[PDB]
Write a protein that binds this ligand. Structure first.
Ligand code: KIG
Ligand code: KIG
Ligand code: KIG
Ligand code: KIG
Lengths: 261, 261, 261, 261
């Protein structure tokens, strides 16, 4: 059907994309980058994250596929040498789709704005101290003082979440995980410390204590928000679909990336 | 219906149990400690854990209730002052049941033995170094060298799991969490480090490398097993049922126990 | 002799400073805020840190004293109720001085600038990814990829250092401690992970890999440096002197601040 | 002068020891394993630790040297291929000695026993819960509830200490470091959490709360002590001397063992 290919932009990835396009020309594959049904990413996980955000309005119509040209990327699970076998099996089709949960972020002002994250969403202060009240399902849970907070999807737990001490969780669990960045704990200030794993339909809300300006990141994009009233996290109802052509299990994907490959 | 009451055994808890028994005598409540339908625990979480293991063969017929006489216990969510209101609402009935997942542990020899855990199951060495191969769904994931490993239920994540760096997870998620105890990491030895959260139907298997003797604990009971061939973890198909008489949410239960009450 | 008093600036601290000034008027105490020999800080640890940096050019001539008006500050070890006994014993003199080590930070451009820190000095990126090569006594030790790094004095180990997982070290040890902020570790990227404690005369140098712009903080002051060639840490030859009027041991100071008071 | 050689006991190490003995026969080297002045260890760090404890009564008369036959050992800083150059330079002499601090452990009963540790000394319970009061220079600092505690030398910080989250500290600092094993922290129970680094002449004392039986380990040897009244840690006045034939800096030794070699 309709497909498109995004490239990291270096000489290695553009030439691989050109070779795949020429290979696709020999089938009933039609290149369309406004309404594709298959989105191929060639580069690293940063390239894949950009592909997902380019098309985050047609997630229900698209199956994604990653090729990693350098360091093995966690979402880009194909080697450049296998690209021809990729074109072929893709051209035939009859693959199986797999879906991972996503994170919804809502930011309220004094007006609303919503974002979808594939890895995580984080909050830090705009300069001064970061102080926020953490409300879970409308009950005040804790006052956080520290560098910031990170809310991760399941497939995001191997990224930023992991460097902060968070747990790795299999993407079949529809959840989100909140981790702390350098919280202060003394006789006067108390946070839970542990990461927290939330089920679907739970809403975590962050609320300002003094400053109302924060640096909010969604995946790779970091933007300073002013006059913020509340930041709202929940597991999205939307899911990203991958096209799988063979079994490549998550825990093997984890083994290959951290234990050795 | 049929009920029974286990006591911590100190003068405070026995007298509370006697007062509740006398209070129950004024209704169609019948004391039966061989086939109860309601099991009341009076003491702390250790007393509750013993109550659960006393009746782990009739978990589908029993709803549990805890009263904490001293330090607020995580499973014993009633104060001694409220015991009369407890007897009354219990006597009437019409409460709502809540269910938490459990962990299944299977130990194979050279012969099998299975256990149910409400908090966690752990493995350490019988003296010498602890070295085990970790197999996830029949794929070799890592060789662990360290003090031991801990596999936790959701409601167990606030116990031993928490002291080891694990995440806290809401009990509506049917999962189990594996945490490390003091793993060695150098150029030669590599573990994942992070906690791992497994969904239902995933099987984690631990396999001996040199020594075949291990100290295996299920909740409070610690037993040395000899001639062990394999230790197998999975989320149980069995669930523990609690009788709830009002909303006491897990995250509030967590707030009260660690942030302050 | 000559003394001065800095105040947090709220109504509570200014009136305490005015009362102490009037109390000092009854002795051979002379107020001088250009060349004092005693510097009193009234507020919190932020107020004390500012007092130290106001006079960091006459550290050898000055003994510092802190009074904490609110939350017990780690450097401000006097209560407002004891201020009159403070004026008196200070007026008499014959106290004992105690000295804590300090951290020297040198920043080279393409030109040099040096700073003294009482708590710590940190480095983060100016926006993009933070990547730095860590050179210890002119040997390349590691390439750090992460959020940033923190180098702490001994008396700084209970501050930012502590929230990052660092050890607490007694101020009689002339050392500095380097801690990581959220380092990435996979098959491709490797840091030591552990905090590192360096003796006097060891030089840790940080060197840019791609970007040359960094956010460098010394205690409370955070400044973006451009065109940076190298950042150099070592234990200073300079020491801060405190005036002590009674035994208040560091580990008790630690107990009171984190265990309870 | 007088030398001796201990071997790991496998075919590789015994033959290396025999070749070195024959090489030593060509000089004024005399084999003596009751009163040596040079002690060579051939194997791994376990072999080196045993060599040190065999001769811990003549530490002032002995310089130690390690050869590692397998995995690079932290104390055994020679390769088997360099053994002939080792015999030669050793035979000539004129090397430089380096000294590392050691840990003293005193155990009191109801009677005393003292031990020297090169890596660390640890304490765990004999079965039940481990609860101990931690007294620092005769002030009660904290009540520890957990799996146990570990007190490390500087050169021990890369061993067990490191796996528990402790800092790595250069051996020129005469200190000891206390780390926690899985401490419980809630509203009722509080430990410091952080590692603690103590200077010379500070005394840390551990005191029983309920049980008086503990498992105490000194380096590799683990022994159950009964009727224990107190366990006392301090930096020893004794030091171990190494014979160095070239510069092999500690931080390079750390880089080679954990970053890569
Ligand atoms: N500032 C980037 C510096 S970088 O070293 O971390 N690069 C990423 C590495 O991370 C792997 N990875 C990813 C990813 C990604 C893309 N990333 C950068 C880009 O969009 O161009 C954005 C993501 O960074 C993560 N992150 C940010 N700051 C830290 C930190 N301090 N520590 C650890 N990660 C951090 C964050 O998650 C952003 O979303 N997604 C992965 C996944 N789901 N699982 C495993 N690896 C994954 C990628 O292959 C490359 O090696
Ligand atoms: N050796 C016990 C020493 S004790 O200090 O930890 N006591 C328990 C504390 O723990 C709270 N708790 C529990 C529980 C329980 C009962 N427990 C002991 C008994 O059966 O008699 C057995 C459980 O211990 C846990 N554990 C063991 N070693 C450690 C450690 N090193 N660190 C932290 N815990 C540890 C392990 O989980 C066993 O199952 N279950 C809880 C829950 N689900 N959530 C929150 N708190 C809970 C209890 O209220 C009391 O305060
Ligand atoms: N952004 C400040 C937010 S604040 O919550 O942390 N405030 C400080 C708390 O810290 C105690 N403290 C200090 C101190 C100090 C002054 N401080 C702020 C000011 O100069 O106005 C600057 C210092 O902050 C430290 N820091 C920064 N970011 C974090 C973080 N993420 N986590 C933990 N600390 C952090 C950093 O060290 C700066 O130097 N010095 C202490 C000491 N030596 N020992 C014990 N407590 C001490 C003070 O009493 C107050 O409670
Ligand atoms: N039960 C041993 C299992 S073992 O995997 O850890 N082996 C040691 C590894 O450790 C390196 N090492 C050493 C050492 C040593 C000798 N050791 C064993 C023996 O005496 O036969 C005894 C030492 O173990 C340490 N330790 C114990 N339990 C743990 C744990 N859970 N995690 C991490 N270490 C642990 C403890 O320190 C004992 O003293 N001394 C080193 C040093 N100073 N610096 C760097 N590496 C060093 C050796 O090369 C080998 O690789």
């Amino acid at each position: 059907m309709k497909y498109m290919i995004t490239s990291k932009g270096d000489e290695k990835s553009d030439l691989l994309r050109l070779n795949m396009i020429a290979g696709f020309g020999e089938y009933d594959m039609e290149y369309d980058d406004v309404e594709p049904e298959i989105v191929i990413s060639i580069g690293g996980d940063g390239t894949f994250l950009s592909a997902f955000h380019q098309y985050e309005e047609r997630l229900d119509e698209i199956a994604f596929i990653g090729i990693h040209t350098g360091h093995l990327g966690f979402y880009a699970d194909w080697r450049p040498a296998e690209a021809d076998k990729l074109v072929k099996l893709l051209a035939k089709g009859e693959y199986q789709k797999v879906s991972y949960p996503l994170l919804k972020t809502t930011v309220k002002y004094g007006k609303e704005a919503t974002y979808l994250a594939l890895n995580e969403s984080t909050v830090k202060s705009s300069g001064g101290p970061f102080v926020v009240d953490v409300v879970i399902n409308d009950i005040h849970f804790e006052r956080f003082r520290g560098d910031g907070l990170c809310m991760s999807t399941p497939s995001g737990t191997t990224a930023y979440n992991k460097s902060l001490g968070g747990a790795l969780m299999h993407p079949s669990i529809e959840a989100m995980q909140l981790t702390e960045m350098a919280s202060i704990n003394n006789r006067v200030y108390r946070t839970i410390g542990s990461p927290l794993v939330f089920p679907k339909h739970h809403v975590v809300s962050l609320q300002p204590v003094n400053d109302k300006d924060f640096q909010i990141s969604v995946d790779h994009l970091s933007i300073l928000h002013r006059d913020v009233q509340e930041i709202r996290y929940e597991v999205s109802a939307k899911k990203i679909h991958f096209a799988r052509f063979r079994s490549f299990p998550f825990w093997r994907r984890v083994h290959d990336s951290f234990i050795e490959d």
